[PDB]
Write an enzyme that holds these catalytic residues in place. Sequence first.
Site, PDB file in Angstrom:
ATOM      1  CG  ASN B 223      34.292   9.616  -0.112  1.00  0.00           C
ATOM      2  OD1 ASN B 223      33.202   9.366  -0.624  1.00  0.00           O
ATOM      3  ND2 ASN B 223      34.425   9.960   1.166  1.00  0.00           N
ATOM      4  CG  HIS B 242      33.467   3.461  -5.667  1.00  0.00           C
ATOM      5  ND1 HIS B 242      32.365   4.057  -5.094  1.00  0.00           N
ATOM      6  CD2 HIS B 242      33.169   2.149  -5.788  1.00  0.00           C
ATOM      7  CE1 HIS B 242      31.434   3.142  -4.890  1.00  0.00           C
ATOM      8  NE2 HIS B 242      31.897   1.976  -5.302  1.00  0.00           N
ATOM      9  CB  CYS B 250      45.485   4.697 -23.304  1.00  0.00           C
ATOM     10  SG  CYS B 250      44.836   4.269 -24.925  1.00  0.00           S
ATOM     11  CB  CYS B 274      46.815   7.594 -25.514  1.00  0.00           C
ATOM     12  SG  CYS B 274      48.310   6.627 -25.691  1.00  0.00           S
ATOM     13  CB  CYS B 277      46.181   5.709 -29.339  1.00  0.00           C
ATOM     14  SG  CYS B 277      46.286   4.072 -28.595  1.00  0.00           S
ATOM     15  CB  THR B 342      27.647   5.810   2.361  1.00  0.00           C
ATOM     16  OG1 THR B 342      27.046   4.866   1.463  1.00  0.00           O
ATOM     17  CG2 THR B 342      27.927   5.129   3.689  1.00  0.00           C
ATOM     18  CB  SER B 343      22.616   6.714   0.004  1.00  0.00           C
ATOM     19  OG  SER B 343      23.395   6.438  -1.151  1.00  0.00           O
ATOM     20  CB  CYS B 383      29.326  12.628   9.846  1.00  0.00           C
ATOM     21  SG  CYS B 383      30.102  13.428   8.426  1.00  0.00           S
TER      22      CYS B 383
HETATM   23  N1  LIG Z   1      27.798  16.039   6.564  1.00  0.00           N
HETATM   24  C1  LIG Z   1      27.069  14.821   6.495  1.00  0.00           C
HETATM   25  N2  LIG Z   1      26.966  14.033   7.580  1.00  0.00           N
HETATM   26  C2  LIG Z   1      26.278  12.871   7.539  1.00  0.00           C
HETATM   27  N3  LIG Z   1      25.683  12.483   6.410  1.00  0.00           N
HETATM   28  C3  LIG Z   1      25.747  13.226   5.290  1.00  0.00           C
HETATM   29  C4  LIG Z   1      26.452  14.431   5.309  1.00  0.00           C
HETATM   30  N4  LIG Z   1      26.345  14.947   4.067  1.00  0.00           N
HETATM   31  C5  LIG Z   1      25.613  14.112   3.310  1.00  0.00           C
HETATM   32  N5  LIG Z   1      25.239  13.070   4.057  1.00  0.00           N
HETATM   33  C6  LIG Z   1      24.468  11.866   3.680  1.00  0.00           C
HETATM   34  O1  LIG Z   1      25.311  11.024   2.936  1.00  0.00           O
HETATM   35  C7  LIG Z   1      24.546  10.318   2.035  1.00  0.00           C
HETATM   36  C8  LIG Z   1      25.089  10.577   0.676  1.00  0.00           C
HETATM   37  O2  LIG Z   1      25.753   9.567  -0.016  1.00  0.00           O
HETATM   38  P1  LIG Z   1      25.529   9.478  -1.577  1.00  0.00           P
HETATM   39  O3  LIG Z   1      25.169  10.843  -2.113  1.00  0.00           O
HETATM   40  O4  LIG Z   1      24.430   8.559  -1.856  1.00  0.00           O
HETATM   41  O5  LIG Z   1      26.823   8.965  -2.225  1.00  0.00           O
HETATM   42  P2  LIG Z   1      27.628   7.732  -1.625  1.00  0.00           P
HETATM   43  O6  LIG Z   1      26.704   6.774  -0.922  1.00  0.00           O
HETATM   44  O7  LIG Z   1      28.695   8.242  -0.695  1.00  0.00           O
HETATM   45  O8  LIG Z   1      28.380   6.986  -2.792  1.00  0.00           O
HETATM   46  C9  LIG Z   1      27.701   6.306  -3.815  1.00  0.00           C
HETATM   47  C10 LIG Z   1      28.449   6.135  -5.107  1.00  0.00           C
HETATM   48  O9  LIG Z   1      27.591   6.323  -6.171  1.00  0.00           O
HETATM   49  C11 LIG Z   1      28.421   6.649  -7.239  1.00  0.00           C
HETATM   50  O10 LIG Z   1      27.722   7.337  -8.204  1.00  0.00           O
HETATM   51  C12 LIG Z   1      29.442   7.490  -6.657  1.00  0.00           C
HETATM   52  O11 LIG Z   1      30.707   7.146  -7.235  1.00  0.00           O
HETATM   53  C13 LIG Z   1      29.431   7.188  -5.259  1.00  0.00           C
HETATM   54  O12 LIG Z   1      30.708   6.713  -4.821  1.00  0.00           O
HETATM   55  C14 LIG Z   1      23.188  10.858   2.108  1.00  0.00           C
HETATM   56  O13 LIG Z   1      22.310   9.910   2.686  1.00  0.00           O
HETATM   57  C15 LIG Z   1      23.262  12.040   2.875  1.00  0.00           C
HETATM   58  O14 LIG Z   1      22.155  12.093   3.733  1.00  0.00           O
HETATM   59 ZN   LIG Z   2      46.946   4.560 -26.131  1.00  0.00          ZN
END
Ligand SMILES: Nc1ncnc2c1ncn2[C@@H]1O[C@H](COP(=O)(O)OP(=O)(O)OC[C@H]2O[C@@H](O)[C@H](O)[C@@H]2O)[C@@H](O)[C@H]1O
Ligand SMILES: [Zn+2]
Lengths: 97, 425
Positions: B223, B242, B250, B274, B277, B342-343, B383
């Site tokens: 995040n 990330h 720049c 910038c 530049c 997170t997925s 969560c």
């Molecule tokens: N309140 C919640 N409680 C539990 N799970 C949740 C909640 N809200 C959403 N989710 C779950 O969190 C997951 C979402 O994560 P993603 O949308 O896939 O993003 P993330 O995995 O955190 O990060 C992936 C990375 O991809 C890049 O593009 C972006 O920079 C990101 O950091 C989903 O599976 C969703 O079910």
């Molecule tokens: Zn510059």
Amino acid sequence: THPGKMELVYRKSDRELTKNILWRIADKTTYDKETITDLIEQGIPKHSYLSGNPLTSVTNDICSVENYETSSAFFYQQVHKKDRLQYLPLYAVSTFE
Amino acid sequence: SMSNDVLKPETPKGPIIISSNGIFYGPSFTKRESLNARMFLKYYGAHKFLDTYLPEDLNSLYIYYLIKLLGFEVKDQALIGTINSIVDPLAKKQTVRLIKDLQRAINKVLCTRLRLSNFFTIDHFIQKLHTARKILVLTGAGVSTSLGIPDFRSSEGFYSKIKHLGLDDPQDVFNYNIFMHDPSVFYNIANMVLPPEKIYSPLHSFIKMLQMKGKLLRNYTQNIDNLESYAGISTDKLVQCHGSFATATCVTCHWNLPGERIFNKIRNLELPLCPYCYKKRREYFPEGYNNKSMSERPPYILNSYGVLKPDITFFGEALPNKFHKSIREDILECDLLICIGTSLKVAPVSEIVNMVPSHVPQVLINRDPVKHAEFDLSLLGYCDDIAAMVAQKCGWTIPHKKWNDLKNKNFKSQEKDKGVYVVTS
Ligand SMILES: Nc1ncnc2c1ncn2[C@@H]1O[C@H](COP(=O)(O)OP(=O)(O)OC[C@H]2O[C@@H](O)[C@H](O)[C@@H]2O)[C@@H](O)[C@H]1O
Ligand SMILES: [Zn+2]
């Protein structure tokens, strides 16, 4: 696909194997132990095991703290329904139920 | 002091159960034998597995059974029927088609985690929390949705919102190569990803709580909102894998400046430029194309010339050094892993789950299962709920405003499978 770079995770070696097998095979109608073992073991990436180290990763250091940037583990552990093999999930619990 | 006894197999008796021989019946195999094989493989290596489970002299028919022994079924129709009837026995072609599929099978097992038989349940997770001195927490976008910030991949998510402004792959918006060619793509949506101020969810405070108890090894976040620091997590305990909006850079001259300095520009959908530049940029872009006639722009000059970019990590870019330094000293030394919100689709962060020692319990807190990972325990649901529930069962106090209301709130845990629970209220 640059190493250690943020990437969304979600082949000449193949024909190399077919070539490499057909070679050691064709002159023989009786295969050997050390033959077939060595024929298998060359399609399997370098790896460690739990006896040789308890700190071995869940992927068997095929993806480990040292190689994770080049990790092929994501590729092997994914076998889709499209693929030849079918994978049977096996999990047993120790329960008082 | 190896805790891997749970993962240690029992050395079986002799080579496999085969040596016309059993054309229909065949040397059948049972789940305990198959699972024990997988364990044997992962415990002793591929070599030993090959040596022991195979006769001192053999034929090509064992190759098919080592596949069945590891709990795989070969789906090739012409090949099946040939084997069913028949019984060197095998053809040359099929014999190769076999050896390949065995290697795939072995590699799939060697690369797949085996769930701990003694950690399947909510109580296990609770008891573990009490004993754990090093806890590694990986948080995704989900932990922030309760604050109004949508996640990336949910149907309510970021990628969907911009997919409705049109693009083939909405993820290209965060693509590094594209930013260099066309910084306008990112800056069009950039306002949407600007962090809110001084807020955090209960779940943030849970991680805060673990830190106070001295149980928190590290918190790795994907995040960029920087909410972690507000909930009290310390700089040594926190890694933003990330990147963050703290600073911008720049992309030509590599100057570095306080991120807030480009926030207005981003709110107004203007290209942050910038100062240093801006001289040469005006020659290549006299007309002021910076906003949301290229004749004066030479082939060696792209649109991103002299453009600032936030220090968050784009796809194809390199993660902060701090990530690499930390993982190297962390993964081995950790006794517990919790994944929250997170997925787990984005590497290298996702590969933390694959690089960790085998005995370490893995726990998932998310509204969805993660199918490509083997989690010892997966609590499915919001969560914040799941955090309150667990904190109750430890007799613990979450340092959040919403605690006094939550500590009495009651939650239902329904087990949908072994190691799988749906937590609600
Ligand atoms: N309140 C919640 N409680 C539990 N799970 C949740 C909640 N809200 C959403 N989710 C779950 O969190 C997951 C979402 O994560 P993603 O949308 O896939 O993003 P993330 O995995 O955190 O990060 C992936 C990375 O991809 C890049 O593009 C972006 O920079 C990101 O950091 C989903 O599976 C969703 O079910
Ligand atoms: Zn510059």
